[PDB]
Ligand binder design. Structure first.
Ligand SMILES: NC(=O)c1ccc[n+]([C@@H]2O[C@H](COP(=O)([O-])OP(=O)(O)OC[C@H]3O[C@@H](n4cnc5c(N)ncnc54)[C@H](OP(=O)(O)O)[C@@H]3O)[C@@H](O)[C@H]2O)c1
Ligand SMILES: Nc1nc(N)c(NC(=O)Nc2ccc(C(=O)N[C@@H](CCC(=O)O)C(=O)O)cc2)c(=O)[nH]1
Ligand SMILES: Nc1nc(N)c(NC(=O)Nc2ccc(C(=O)N[C@@H](CCC(=O)O)C(=O)O)cc2)c(=O)[nH]1
Lengths: 297, 297
């Protein structure tokens, strides 16, 4: 029987990173010695955050980037965190700064993020940068990495977006929020819903949607039987779920009931191995774009 | 024979303005003469635009503000427009700048608005200020005027928003776009319809909606029959429709088929007399907030 095409995010990331690597080796030869510099700051020891930072550094290193890795304690003072951001602002060879979220509760997140120099805001977390996405008459320099990865996976699918009904579940600053904007810019009719939105409404909305982007962080939220036949389903959820057989005691589970959804969708992405690897690749893309902009002098 | 409550925008707007007037009076004593300065720039002679700026200036004067009224010709060049904006950026006595839309078609709207100094952006049109709107944990200073007026009227009516089904028709930068953002921050289920949405889908979406906010500028777009029994209906449409009995040769007509919708809805706004007057009030509120920020220096 027909079933959804499972889009392989690892292969998509691989191809992107192959092209980035060759681009860097060319640029270095053109700009005697220069190369993109990525900074990642992690506070505390959440195992999932540790994993994602390690993967970013590893990818960056593989593509010929330089890494500026910072690790701070759960304890970190507002001042110590901001001083570290500022240090990276003045480092010429650092073109991107990533502050891995979530931050510890006691930190003022907005304050701290606001210290990042706009030209180095690789996550597109700053108002001056996120406030650009809605301008369709201009193409924005930076787009948040997760949102960007979703759009890249839709591009890979090749599904039409204009005139289509889209549901985005969740409204996270680097995922749900920016992606709804980017989908509407492509002339989709976008509905936004939340994990705790009444289920009867979510079901009704998903049933009518040509494209599903789930970024609510709630495993099994999107029932397979709600999926409209031939829909494209992009699963951004990456929620830790207890599994004593795995290295950190949990597995990552997506928002979508994939086993049922794959029988109805035209396209679907798996978790792990879908949006996540491409999210890392988009950070490297933003960073190379920022590198090139700064080198135009 | 039972019917919607018709929300009285003029009365809301007057309540807000009596508050602003007191506030200005005390600040003028505190800061020995200083007062909020509002500049309104109009290009050309659209009768509706002329009316709206005249109402803004009149309300500003009544609340004790200083007006910087600028009139430019319909054939104003991009440079002369931007030069005027720049002049107002450098004027210490000016705290808010409004560039009345729509601009003449030869004018690049985005480039022109981009010259406004961020702290004087009265309409909250610039990326740095659009970019703060989602930040709930802070209370931003500047709020888009039409959008905040819509929220104000909903609040006045006691209407629930969190978890309700909301449809916004239109996505223009003055009305549709920010309205949708503000309603989404309330964790409403928000669908945005626009010109690429097929009409049949519009009808279905409106029928399922607890709150309808129409900012398309198309008279008669929202059929009364589509309105869910008990819904709240906010008409942001203000289209000039020919009527030679009226002073400018036109009357203002809303997006909503009001006479039919009034029999089904629980709350509705009239056009005129609804969102319009409150939009003006919210401009003055912004302007007073921007003044207060400015004089902390
Ligand atoms: N001109 C004035 O003096 C003035 C000033 C303020 C407010 N208003 C009123 O408030 C409204 C706000 O609009 P705006 O000034 O922010 O910009 P605008 O360009 O008038 O916005 C119109 C929006 O409605 C959409 N739309 C238009 N016709 C439609 C239809 N038949 N079906 C579905 N969607 C439709 C457009 O879609 P696309 O994005 O696909 O084009 C656009 O997003 C105006 O339409 C007007 O009635 C008027
Ligand atoms: N500042 C900032 N904070 C954030 N929290 C994010 N999210 C942010 O990095 N997410 C993310 C999610 C998944 C993966 C990933 O590659 N996951 C692998 C598997 C992970 C694993 O091995 O457990 C996969 O899904 O295939 C990488 C990054 C971000 O992009 N920027
Ligand atoms: N930059 C910019 N451009 C814009 N086009 C707007 N909109 C922008 O001023 N709208 C507006 C709409 C209605 C009224 C208003 O008071 N209308 C009266 C009718 C007045 C009359 O026609 O006599 C009413 O609805 O009751 C005032 C302002 C704006 O806020 N900023």
């Amino acid at each position: 029987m027909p079933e959804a095409v499972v889009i392989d995010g690892r292969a998509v990331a691989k191809a992107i990173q192959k092209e980035l690597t060759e681009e860097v080796a060319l640029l270095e030869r053109r700009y005697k010695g220069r190369r993109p510099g990525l900074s990642t700051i992690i506070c505390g020891k959440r195992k999932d955050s540790q994993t994602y930072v390690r993967l970013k550094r590893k990818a960056a290193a593989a593509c010929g980037f330089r890494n500026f890795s910072v690790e701070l304690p759960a304890n970190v003072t507002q001042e110590a965190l901001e001083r570290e951001v500022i240090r990276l602002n003045e480092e010429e060879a650092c073109h991107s700064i990533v502050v891995q979220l979530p931050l510890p509760p006691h930190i003022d997140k907005v304050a701290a993020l606001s210290k990042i120099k706009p030209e180095k805001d690789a996550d597109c977390l700053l108002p001056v940068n996120v406030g650009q996405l809605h301008i369709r008459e201009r193409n924005p320099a930076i787009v948040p990495c997760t949102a960007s990865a979703v759009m890249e996976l839709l591009r890979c699918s090749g599904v039409e977006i204009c005139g289509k009904r889209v549901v985005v579940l969740g409204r996270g600053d680097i995922a749900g929020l920016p992606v709804a904007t980017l989908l509407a810019n492509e002339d989709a009719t976008v509905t936004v819903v939340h994990s705790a939105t009444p289920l009867c409404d979510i079901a009704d909305i998903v049933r009518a949607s040509d494209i599903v982007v789930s970024a609510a962080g709630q495993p099994g939220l999107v029932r397979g039987e709600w999926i409209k036949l031939g829909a494209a389903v992009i699963d951004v959820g990456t929620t830790p779920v207890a599994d004593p057989s795995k290295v950190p005691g949990y597995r990552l589970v997506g928002d979508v009931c994939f086993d049922v959804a794959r029988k109805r969708a035209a396209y679907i992405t798996p978790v792990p191995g879908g949006v996540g690897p491409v999210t890392v690749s988009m950070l490297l893309k933003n960073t190379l774009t920022m590198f090139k902009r700064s080198v135009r002098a």
